[PDB]
Amino acid sequence: SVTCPGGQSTSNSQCCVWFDVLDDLQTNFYQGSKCESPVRKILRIVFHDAIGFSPALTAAGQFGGGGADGSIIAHSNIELAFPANGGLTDTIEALRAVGINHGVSFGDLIQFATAVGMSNCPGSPRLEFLTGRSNSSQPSPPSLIPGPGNTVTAILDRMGDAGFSPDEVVDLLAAHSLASQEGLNSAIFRSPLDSTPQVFDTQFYIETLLKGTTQPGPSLGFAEELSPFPGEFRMRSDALLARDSRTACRWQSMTSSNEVMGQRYRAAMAKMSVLGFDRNALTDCSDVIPSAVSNNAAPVIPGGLTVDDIEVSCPSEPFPEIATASGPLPSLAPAP
Numbered sequence: 301s302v303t304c305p306g307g308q309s310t311s312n313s314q315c316c317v318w319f320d321v322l323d324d325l326q327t328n329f330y331q332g333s334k335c336e337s338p339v340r341k342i343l344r345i346v347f348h349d350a351i352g353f354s355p356a357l358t359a360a361g362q363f364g365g366g367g368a369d370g371s372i373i374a375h376s377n378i379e380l381a382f383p384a385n386g387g388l389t390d391t392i393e394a395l396r397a398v399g400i401n402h403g404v405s406f407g408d409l410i411q412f413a414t415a416v417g418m419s420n421c422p423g424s425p426r427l428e429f430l431t432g433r434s435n436s437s438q439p440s441p442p443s444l445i446p447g448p449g450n451t452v453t454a455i456l457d458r459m460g461d462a463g464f465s466p467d468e469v470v471d472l473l474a475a476h477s478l479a480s481q482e483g484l485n486s487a488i489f490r491s492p493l494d495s496t497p498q499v500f501d502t503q504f505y506i507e508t509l510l511k512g513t514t515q516p517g518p519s520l521g522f523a524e525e526l527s528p529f530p531g532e533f534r535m536r537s538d539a540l541l542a543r544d545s546r547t548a549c550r551w552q553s554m555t556s557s558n559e560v561m562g563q564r565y566r567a568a569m570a571k572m573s574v575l576g577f578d579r580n581a582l583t584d585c586s587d588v589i590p591s592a593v594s595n596n597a598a599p600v601i602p603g604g605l606t607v608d609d610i611e612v613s614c615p616s617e618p619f620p621e622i623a624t625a626s627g628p629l630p631s632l633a634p635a636p
């Protein structure tokens with residue numbers, strides 16, 4: 301409809317500024333449209349920006365947080381002191397500069413960079429992108445980000461307050477398909493959470509269900525559990541959620557279909573993206589977000605393990621027929 305200066309066809313002139321933000325992020329922040337540490341850090345940031353939203357605090361006479369409001373950037377001095385916000389300041393500063401240079405709100409930028417980053421990762425769905433969130437924010441209250449040592453009850457209660465059902469918690473955790481740790485165990489920096497940290501696929505759900513046999517580092521870090529093979533890190537929250545009766549059937553249903561996983565994640569991310577906002581007051585610029593390269597690989601149980609190594613935790617559904625591989629066990633390289 302609208303033609304931006306660049307030749308760029310879009311739905312609304314409010315989308316035109318985002319083509320320049322796209323180019324900048326793809327060249328610079330993403331270092332040539334790659335799916336590496338910048339994407340992974342941005343996914344932590346989108347979650348930790350949005351989840352600072354608590355109707356229970358509002359109901360108890362207190363500021364509950366503004367949700368997807370960019371507060372993690374605007375008020376980084378306060379929020380990057382939270383336990384869950386370590387290892388993010390360098391990324392936050394990069395985003396701060398992009399936001400100021402292009403004159404876009406910090407809340408919108410985080411959501412945009414999320415959709416753009418996802419688009420660089422094979423197999424990703426096309427995330428929605430809406431523009432118009434006010435740049436104004438107050439600091440998030442403390443203690444709103446679920447931690448990897450939290451019980452399943454605590455995680456579901458916190459996520460629940462923010463607005464997510466147990467299914468949607470599982471759906472949002474598909475981001476751990478593009479993931480490593482740096483801050484839990486300093487001896488195995490960027491140890492992946494799944495065997496394909498640069499492919500948005502079901503491997504995370506499969507591999508967290510394997511029997512824990514392996515200590516990847518010389519000692520355990522915070523909230524670390526045994527993993528199924530060298531190089532892979534397993535955090536306690538993921539281990540527990542995979543196995544808990546409240547989340548295990550959804551977890552298991554993610555294992556065989558990249559396509560259903562992507563749909564569910566897209567829907568949950570759309571919901572998360574507007575905590576603290578009315579989506580109907582925003583402008584849809586989803587057309588700025590390109591599709592990702594498709595992922596042609598099939599789900600697999602790695603390394604000669606079989607379904608007998610899966611701790612099947614959904615008591616009503618058989619484990620899906622998933623291909624196995626040759627041994628021996630893999631050793632995961634650090635995520636790039």
Ligand code: HEM
Nearest residue numbers: 340343344347446447448472475479480481482483484537
């Ligand atoms: C039950 C809730 C969740 C908990 C307890 C949790 C916990 C963690 C922790 C402890 C790390 C490791 C950070 C480090 O040491 O470097 C991690 C990494 C990561 N998380 Fe989560 N997370 C959760 C949900 C999510 C959600 C909803 C998203 C985003 C949609 C997300 C995206 C990621 C990504 C992409 C990484 C990898 C970062 C990297 O490779 O640098 N997480 N998460």
Ligand SMILES: *[C@@H]1O[C@H](CO)[C@@H](O[C@@H]2O[C@H](CO)[C@@H](O)[C@H](O)[C@H]2NC(C)=O)[C@H](O)[C@H]1NC(C)=O
Nearest residue numbers: 373374375396399400402403404405406435436
């Ligand atoms: C969004 O609000 C933040 C906070 O007021 C603004 O960030 C400041 O921007 C000025 C001017 O560019 C910089 O000198 C400060 O370093 C920034 N402070 C912080 C904490 O980042 C930002 O400019 C506002 N963005 C828009 C589009 O208005």
Ligand SMILES: *[C@H]1O[C@H](CO)[C@@H](O)[C@H](O)[C@@H]1O
Nearest residue numbers: 516530531631632633634
């Ligand atoms: C096996 O090999 C990988 C590197 O190829 C390591 O990342 C892992 O910790 C294990 O030594």
Ligand SMILES: [Ca+2]
Nearest residue numbers: 349367369371
């Ligand atoms: Ca926030």
Ligand SMILES: [Ca+2]
Nearest residue numbers: 477496499501
């Ligand atoms: Ca993966």
